PDB file of C-alpha atoms in Angstrom:
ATOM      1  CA  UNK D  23      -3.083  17.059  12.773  1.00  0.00           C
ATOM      2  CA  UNK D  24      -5.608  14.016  12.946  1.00  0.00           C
ATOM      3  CA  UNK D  25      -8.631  14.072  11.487  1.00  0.00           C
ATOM      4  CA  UNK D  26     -10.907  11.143  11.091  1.00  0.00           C
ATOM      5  CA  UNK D  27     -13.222  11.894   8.249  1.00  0.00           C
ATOM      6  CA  UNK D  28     -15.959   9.462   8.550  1.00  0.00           C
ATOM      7  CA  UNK D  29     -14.046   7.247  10.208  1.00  0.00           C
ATOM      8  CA  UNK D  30     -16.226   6.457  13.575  1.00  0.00           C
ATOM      9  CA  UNK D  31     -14.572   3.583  14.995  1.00  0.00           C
ATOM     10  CA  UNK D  32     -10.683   5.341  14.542  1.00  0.00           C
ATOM     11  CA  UNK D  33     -12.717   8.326  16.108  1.00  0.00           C
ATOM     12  CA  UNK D  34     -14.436   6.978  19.268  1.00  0.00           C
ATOM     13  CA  UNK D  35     -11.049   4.879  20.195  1.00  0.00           C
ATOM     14  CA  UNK D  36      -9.235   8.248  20.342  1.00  0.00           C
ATOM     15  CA  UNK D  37     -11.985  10.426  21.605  1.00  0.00           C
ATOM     16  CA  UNK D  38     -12.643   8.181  24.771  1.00  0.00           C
ATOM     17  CA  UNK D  39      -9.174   8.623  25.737  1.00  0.00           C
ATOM     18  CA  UNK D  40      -9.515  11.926  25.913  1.00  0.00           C
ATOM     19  CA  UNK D  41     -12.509  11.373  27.917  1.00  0.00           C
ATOM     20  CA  UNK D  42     -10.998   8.648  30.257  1.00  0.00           C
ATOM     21  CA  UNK D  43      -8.754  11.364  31.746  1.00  0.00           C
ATOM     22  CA  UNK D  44     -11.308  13.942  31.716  1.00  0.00           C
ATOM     23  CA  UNK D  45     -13.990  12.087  33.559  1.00  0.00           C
ATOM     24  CA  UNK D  46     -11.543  11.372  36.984  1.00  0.00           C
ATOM     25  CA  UNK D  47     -11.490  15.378  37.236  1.00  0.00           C
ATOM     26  CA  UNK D  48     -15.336  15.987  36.835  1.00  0.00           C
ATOM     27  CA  UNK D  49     -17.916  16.079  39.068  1.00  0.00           C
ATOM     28  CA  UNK D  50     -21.492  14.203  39.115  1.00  0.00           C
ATOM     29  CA  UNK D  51     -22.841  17.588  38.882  1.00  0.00           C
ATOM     30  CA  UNK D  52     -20.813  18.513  35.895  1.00  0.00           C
ATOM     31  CA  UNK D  53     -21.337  15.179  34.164  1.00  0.00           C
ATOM     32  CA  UNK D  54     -25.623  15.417  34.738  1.00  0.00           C
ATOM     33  CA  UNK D  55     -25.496  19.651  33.410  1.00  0.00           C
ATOM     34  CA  UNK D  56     -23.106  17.956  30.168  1.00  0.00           C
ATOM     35  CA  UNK D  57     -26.038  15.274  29.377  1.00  0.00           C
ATOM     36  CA  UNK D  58     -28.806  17.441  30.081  1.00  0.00           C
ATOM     37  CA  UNK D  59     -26.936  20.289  27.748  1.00  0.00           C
ATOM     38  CA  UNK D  60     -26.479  17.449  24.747  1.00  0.00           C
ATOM     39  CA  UNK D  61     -30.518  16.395  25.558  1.00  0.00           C
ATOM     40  CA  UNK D  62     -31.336  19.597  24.794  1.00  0.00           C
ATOM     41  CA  UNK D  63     -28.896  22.484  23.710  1.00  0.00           C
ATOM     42  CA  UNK D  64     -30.843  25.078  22.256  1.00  0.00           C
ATOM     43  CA  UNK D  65     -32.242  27.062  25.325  1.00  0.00           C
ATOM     44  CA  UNK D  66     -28.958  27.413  26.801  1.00  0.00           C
ATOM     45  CA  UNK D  67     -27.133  28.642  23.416  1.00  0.00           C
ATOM     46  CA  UNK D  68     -30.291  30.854  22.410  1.00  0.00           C
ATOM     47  CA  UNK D  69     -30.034  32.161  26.276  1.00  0.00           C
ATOM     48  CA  UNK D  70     -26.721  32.679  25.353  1.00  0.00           C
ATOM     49  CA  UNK D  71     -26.528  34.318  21.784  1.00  0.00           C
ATOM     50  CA  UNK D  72     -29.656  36.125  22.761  1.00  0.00           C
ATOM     51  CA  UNK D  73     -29.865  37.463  26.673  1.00  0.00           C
ATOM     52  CA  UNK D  74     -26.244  36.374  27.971  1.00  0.00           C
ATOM     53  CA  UNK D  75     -25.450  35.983  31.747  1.00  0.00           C
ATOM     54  CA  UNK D  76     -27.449  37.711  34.294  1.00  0.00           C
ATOM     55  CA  UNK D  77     -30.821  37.057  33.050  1.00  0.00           C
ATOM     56  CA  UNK D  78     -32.163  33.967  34.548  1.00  0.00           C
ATOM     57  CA  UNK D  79     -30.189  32.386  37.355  1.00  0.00           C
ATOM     58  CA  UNK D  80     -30.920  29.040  36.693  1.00  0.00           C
ATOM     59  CA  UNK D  81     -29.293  29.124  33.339  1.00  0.00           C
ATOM     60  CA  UNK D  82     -26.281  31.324  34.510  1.00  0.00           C
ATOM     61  CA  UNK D  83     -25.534  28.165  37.371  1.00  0.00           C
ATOM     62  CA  UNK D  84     -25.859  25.293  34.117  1.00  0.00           C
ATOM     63  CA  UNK D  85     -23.395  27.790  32.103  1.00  0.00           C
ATOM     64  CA  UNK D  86     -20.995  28.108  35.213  1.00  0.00           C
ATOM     65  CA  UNK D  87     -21.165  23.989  35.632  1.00  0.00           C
ATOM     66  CA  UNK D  88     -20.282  23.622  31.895  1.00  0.00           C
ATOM     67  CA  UNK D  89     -18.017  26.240  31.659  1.00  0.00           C
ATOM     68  CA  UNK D  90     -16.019  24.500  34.661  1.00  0.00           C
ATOM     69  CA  UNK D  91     -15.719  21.523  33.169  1.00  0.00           C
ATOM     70  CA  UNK D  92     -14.796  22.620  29.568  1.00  0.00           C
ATOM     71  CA  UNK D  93     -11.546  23.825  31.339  1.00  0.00           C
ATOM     72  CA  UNK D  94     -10.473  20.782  32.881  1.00  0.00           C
ATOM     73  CA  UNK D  95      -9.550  19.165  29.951  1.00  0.00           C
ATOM     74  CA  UNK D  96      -6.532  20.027  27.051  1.00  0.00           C
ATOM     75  CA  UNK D  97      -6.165  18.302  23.618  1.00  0.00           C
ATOM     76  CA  UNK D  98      -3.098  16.189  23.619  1.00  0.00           C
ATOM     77  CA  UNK D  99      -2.913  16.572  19.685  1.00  0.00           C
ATOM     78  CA  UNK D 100      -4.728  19.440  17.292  1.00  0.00           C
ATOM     79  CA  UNK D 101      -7.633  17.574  15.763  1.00  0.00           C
ATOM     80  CA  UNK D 102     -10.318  18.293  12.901  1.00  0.00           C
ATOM     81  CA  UNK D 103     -14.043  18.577  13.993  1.00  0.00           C
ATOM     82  CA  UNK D 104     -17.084  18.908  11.553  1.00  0.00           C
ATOM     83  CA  UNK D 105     -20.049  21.025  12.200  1.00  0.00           C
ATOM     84  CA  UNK D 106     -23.542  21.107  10.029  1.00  0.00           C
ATOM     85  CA  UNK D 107     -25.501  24.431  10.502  1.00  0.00           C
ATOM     86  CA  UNK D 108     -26.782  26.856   8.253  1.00  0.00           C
ATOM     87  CA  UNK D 109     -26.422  30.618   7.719  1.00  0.00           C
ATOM     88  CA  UNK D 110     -26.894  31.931  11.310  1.00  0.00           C
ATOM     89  CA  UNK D 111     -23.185  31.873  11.519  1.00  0.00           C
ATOM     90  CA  UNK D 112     -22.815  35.081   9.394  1.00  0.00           C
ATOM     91  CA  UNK D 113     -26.025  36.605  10.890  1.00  0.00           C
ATOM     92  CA  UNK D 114     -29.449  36.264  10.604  1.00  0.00           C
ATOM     93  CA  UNK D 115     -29.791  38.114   7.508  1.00  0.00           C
ATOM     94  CA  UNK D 116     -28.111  35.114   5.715  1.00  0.00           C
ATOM     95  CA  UNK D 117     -29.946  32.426   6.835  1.00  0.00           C
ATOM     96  CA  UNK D 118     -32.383  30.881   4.804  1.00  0.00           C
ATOM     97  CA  UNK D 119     -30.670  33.191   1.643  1.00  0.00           C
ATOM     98  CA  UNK D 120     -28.565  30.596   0.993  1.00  0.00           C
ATOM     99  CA  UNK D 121     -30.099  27.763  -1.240  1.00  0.00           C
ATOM    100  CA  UNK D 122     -32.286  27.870  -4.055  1.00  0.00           C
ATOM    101  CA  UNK D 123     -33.272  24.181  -3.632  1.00  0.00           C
ATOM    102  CA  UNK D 124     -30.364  21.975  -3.961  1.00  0.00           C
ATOM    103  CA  UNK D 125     -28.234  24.375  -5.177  1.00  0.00           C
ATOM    104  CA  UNK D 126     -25.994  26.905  -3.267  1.00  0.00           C
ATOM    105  CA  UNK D 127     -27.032  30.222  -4.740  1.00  0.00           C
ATOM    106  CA  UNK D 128     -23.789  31.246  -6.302  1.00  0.00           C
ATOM    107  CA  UNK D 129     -24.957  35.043  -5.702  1.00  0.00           C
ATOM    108  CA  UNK D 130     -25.190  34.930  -2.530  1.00  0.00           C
ATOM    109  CA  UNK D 131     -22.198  32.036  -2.037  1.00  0.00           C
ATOM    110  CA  UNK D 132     -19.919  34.752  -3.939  1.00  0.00           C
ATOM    111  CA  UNK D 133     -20.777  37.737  -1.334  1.00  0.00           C
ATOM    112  CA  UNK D 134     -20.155  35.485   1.771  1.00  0.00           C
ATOM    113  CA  UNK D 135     -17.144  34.364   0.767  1.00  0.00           C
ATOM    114  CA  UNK D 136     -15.909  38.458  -0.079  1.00  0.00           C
ATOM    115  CA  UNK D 137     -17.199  39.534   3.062  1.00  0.00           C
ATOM    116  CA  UNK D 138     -16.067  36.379   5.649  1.00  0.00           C
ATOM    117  CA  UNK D 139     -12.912  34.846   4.382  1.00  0.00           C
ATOM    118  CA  UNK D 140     -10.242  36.085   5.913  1.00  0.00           C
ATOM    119  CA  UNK D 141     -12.330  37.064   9.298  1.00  0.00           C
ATOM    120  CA  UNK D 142     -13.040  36.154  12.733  1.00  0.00           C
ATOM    121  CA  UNK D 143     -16.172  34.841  14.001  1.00  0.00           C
ATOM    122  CA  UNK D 144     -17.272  34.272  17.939  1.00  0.00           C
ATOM    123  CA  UNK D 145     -19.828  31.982  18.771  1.00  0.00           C
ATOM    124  CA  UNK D 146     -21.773  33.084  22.074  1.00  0.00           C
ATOM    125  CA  UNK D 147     -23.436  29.213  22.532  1.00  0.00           C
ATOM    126  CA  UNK D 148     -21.420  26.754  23.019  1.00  0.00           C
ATOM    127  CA  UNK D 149     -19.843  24.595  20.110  1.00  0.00           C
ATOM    128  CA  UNK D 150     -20.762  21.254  19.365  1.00  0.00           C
ATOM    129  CA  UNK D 151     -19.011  19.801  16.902  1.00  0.00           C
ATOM    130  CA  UNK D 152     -18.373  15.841  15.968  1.00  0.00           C
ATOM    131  CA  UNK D 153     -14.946  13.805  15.774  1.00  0.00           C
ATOM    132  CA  UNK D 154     -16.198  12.601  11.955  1.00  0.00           C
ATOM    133  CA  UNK D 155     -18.162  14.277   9.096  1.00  0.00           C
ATOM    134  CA  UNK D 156     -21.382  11.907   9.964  1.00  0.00           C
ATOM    135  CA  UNK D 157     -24.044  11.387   7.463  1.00  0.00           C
ATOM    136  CA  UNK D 158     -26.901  13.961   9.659  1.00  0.00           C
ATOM    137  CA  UNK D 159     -24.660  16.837   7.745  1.00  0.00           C
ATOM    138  CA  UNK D 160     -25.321  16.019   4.081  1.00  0.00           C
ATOM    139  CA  UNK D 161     -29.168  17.909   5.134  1.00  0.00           C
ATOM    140  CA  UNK D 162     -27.408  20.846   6.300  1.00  0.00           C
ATOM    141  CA  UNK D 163     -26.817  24.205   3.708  1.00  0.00           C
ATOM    142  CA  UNK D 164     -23.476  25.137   5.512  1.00  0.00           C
ATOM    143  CA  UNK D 165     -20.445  22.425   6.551  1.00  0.00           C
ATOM    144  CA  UNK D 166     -17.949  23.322   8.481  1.00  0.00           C
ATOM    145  CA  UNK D 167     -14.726  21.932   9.212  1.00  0.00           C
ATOM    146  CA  UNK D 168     -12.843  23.343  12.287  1.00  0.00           C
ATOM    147  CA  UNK D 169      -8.995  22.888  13.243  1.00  0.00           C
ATOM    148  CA  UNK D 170      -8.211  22.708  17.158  1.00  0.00           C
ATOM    149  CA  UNK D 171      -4.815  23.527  18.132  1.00  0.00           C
ATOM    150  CA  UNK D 172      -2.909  21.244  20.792  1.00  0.00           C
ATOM    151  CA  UNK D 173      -3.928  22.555  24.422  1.00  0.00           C
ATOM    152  CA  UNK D 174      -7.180  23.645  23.511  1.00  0.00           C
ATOM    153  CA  UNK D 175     -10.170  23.746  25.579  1.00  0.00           C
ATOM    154  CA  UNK D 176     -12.454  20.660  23.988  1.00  0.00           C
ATOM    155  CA  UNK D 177     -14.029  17.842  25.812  1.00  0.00           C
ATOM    156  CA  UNK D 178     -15.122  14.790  23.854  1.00  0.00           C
ATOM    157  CA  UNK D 179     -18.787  14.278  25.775  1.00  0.00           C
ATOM    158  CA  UNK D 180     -20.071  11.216  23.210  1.00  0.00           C
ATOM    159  CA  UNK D 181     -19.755   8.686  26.565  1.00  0.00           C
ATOM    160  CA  UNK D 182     -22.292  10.781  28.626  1.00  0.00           C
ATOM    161  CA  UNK D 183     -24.073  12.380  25.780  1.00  0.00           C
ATOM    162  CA  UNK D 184     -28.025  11.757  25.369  1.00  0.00           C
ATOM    163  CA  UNK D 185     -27.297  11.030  21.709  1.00  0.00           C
ATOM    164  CA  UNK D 186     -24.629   8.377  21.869  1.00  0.00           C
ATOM    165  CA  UNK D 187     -22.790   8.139  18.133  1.00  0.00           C
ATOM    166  CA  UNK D 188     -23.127  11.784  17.752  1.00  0.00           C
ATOM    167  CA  UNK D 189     -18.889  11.445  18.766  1.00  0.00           C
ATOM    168  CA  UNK D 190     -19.416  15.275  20.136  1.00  0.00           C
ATOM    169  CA  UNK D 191     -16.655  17.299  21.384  1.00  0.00           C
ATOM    170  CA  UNK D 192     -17.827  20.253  22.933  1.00  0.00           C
ATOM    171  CA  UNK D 193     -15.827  23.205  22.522  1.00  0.00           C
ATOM    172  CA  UNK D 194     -15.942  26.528  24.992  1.00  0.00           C
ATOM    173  CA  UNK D 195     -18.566  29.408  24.962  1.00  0.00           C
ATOM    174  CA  UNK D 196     -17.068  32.228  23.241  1.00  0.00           C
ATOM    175  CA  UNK D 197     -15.259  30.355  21.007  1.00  0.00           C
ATOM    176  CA  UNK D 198     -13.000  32.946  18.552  1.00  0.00           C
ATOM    177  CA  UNK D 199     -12.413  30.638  15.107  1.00  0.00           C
ATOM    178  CA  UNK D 200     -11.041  32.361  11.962  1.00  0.00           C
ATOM    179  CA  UNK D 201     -12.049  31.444   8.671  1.00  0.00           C
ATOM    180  CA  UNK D 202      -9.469  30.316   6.289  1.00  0.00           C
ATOM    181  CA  UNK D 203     -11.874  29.480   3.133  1.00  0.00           C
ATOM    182  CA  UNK D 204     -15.599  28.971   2.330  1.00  0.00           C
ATOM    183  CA  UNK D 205     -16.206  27.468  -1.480  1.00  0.00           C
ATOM    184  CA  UNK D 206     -19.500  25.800  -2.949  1.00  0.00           C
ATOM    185  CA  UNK D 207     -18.986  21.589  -2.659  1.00  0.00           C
ATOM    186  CA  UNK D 208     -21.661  19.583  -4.731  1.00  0.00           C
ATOM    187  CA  UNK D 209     -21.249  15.988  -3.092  1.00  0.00           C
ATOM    188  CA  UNK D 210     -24.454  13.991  -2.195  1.00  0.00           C
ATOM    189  CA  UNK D 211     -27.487  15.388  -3.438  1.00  0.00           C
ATOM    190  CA  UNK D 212     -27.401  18.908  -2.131  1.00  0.00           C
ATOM    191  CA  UNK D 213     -24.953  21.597  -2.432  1.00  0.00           C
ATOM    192  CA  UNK D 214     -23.524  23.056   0.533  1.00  0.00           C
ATOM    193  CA  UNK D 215     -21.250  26.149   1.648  1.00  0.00           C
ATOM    194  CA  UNK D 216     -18.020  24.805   2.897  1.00  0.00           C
ATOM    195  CA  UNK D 217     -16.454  26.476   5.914  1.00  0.00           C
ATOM    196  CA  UNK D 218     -12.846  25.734   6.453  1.00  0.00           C
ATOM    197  CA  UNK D 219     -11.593  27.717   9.608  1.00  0.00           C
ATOM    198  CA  UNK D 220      -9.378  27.584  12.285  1.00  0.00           C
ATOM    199  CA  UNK D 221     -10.025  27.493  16.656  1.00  0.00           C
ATOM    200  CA  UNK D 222      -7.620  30.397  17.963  1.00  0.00           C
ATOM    201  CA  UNK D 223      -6.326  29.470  21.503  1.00  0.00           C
TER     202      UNK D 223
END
């Protein structure tokens, strides 16, 4: 298992040779939808987690070009990714529920660890995630840290994405991860909800 922590110039070494190979398989097509998607991701994942294929045709032909090039590529070794977010991931109801300033609400941190450890979410957007645990994450309320198994579907985009240093690898639509553990962490200046959970394959 790698994992690179904060480590960005271990991380981009070994993410661009993941790229390298990917990049001889896609097409310019597929490339332009990738940079447009890390431009500007949230229509397509709202369109996604909120009207799904078959509403606007448009979207449903940038979802097809993504979703085609997600699958030519395969992790050579299971790697750690970090994603910032906040309570959408355990519904709506959550969000914003979660902090009482800079402090996790231990309430409310108590009931979503009861009723999520131990469970399997599915994100309908895609995934974006990051190689390291980079410093735009200590603002979030919710960390996450994500195992991906060897062969997995995950394609570092940081060489074509509109937000170079970002170190982004982009996993599927649809993605099934299972959470092993969520617990309070107090580092920085905020408290957060930390998400340790696993990509199933």
């Amino acid at each position: 298992m790698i994992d690179f922590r904060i480590d960005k110039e271990k991380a981009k070494k070994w993410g661009k040779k993941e790229y390298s190979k990917w990049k001889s398989t896609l097409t310019e097509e597929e490339k332009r939808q990738i940079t447009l998607y890390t431009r500007n991701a949230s229509p397509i994942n709202t369109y996604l987690r909120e009207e799904g294929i078959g509403s606007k045709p448009d979207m449903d032909k940038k979802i097809e070009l993504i979703d085609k090039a997600l699958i030519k590529t395969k992790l050579k070794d299971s790697v750690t990714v970090y994603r910032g977010t906040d309570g959408i991931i355990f519904g709506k109801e959550f969000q914003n529920t979660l902090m009482n300033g800079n402090k996790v609400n231990g309430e409310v941190a108590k009931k979503i660890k009861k009723e999520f450890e131990g469970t399997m979410l599915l994100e309908r957007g895609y995934l974006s995630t990051s190689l390291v645990n980079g410093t735009l994450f200590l603002a979030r309320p919710v960390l996450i840290e994500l195992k991906i198994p060897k062969g997995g579907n995950a394609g570092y985009v940081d060489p074509i994405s509109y937000y170079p240093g970002q170190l982004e690898m982009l996993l599927p639509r649809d993605t099934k991860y299972y959470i092993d553990n969520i617990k309070i962490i107090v580092n920085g200046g905020s408290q957060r909800l930390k998400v340790e959970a696993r990509v199933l394959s």
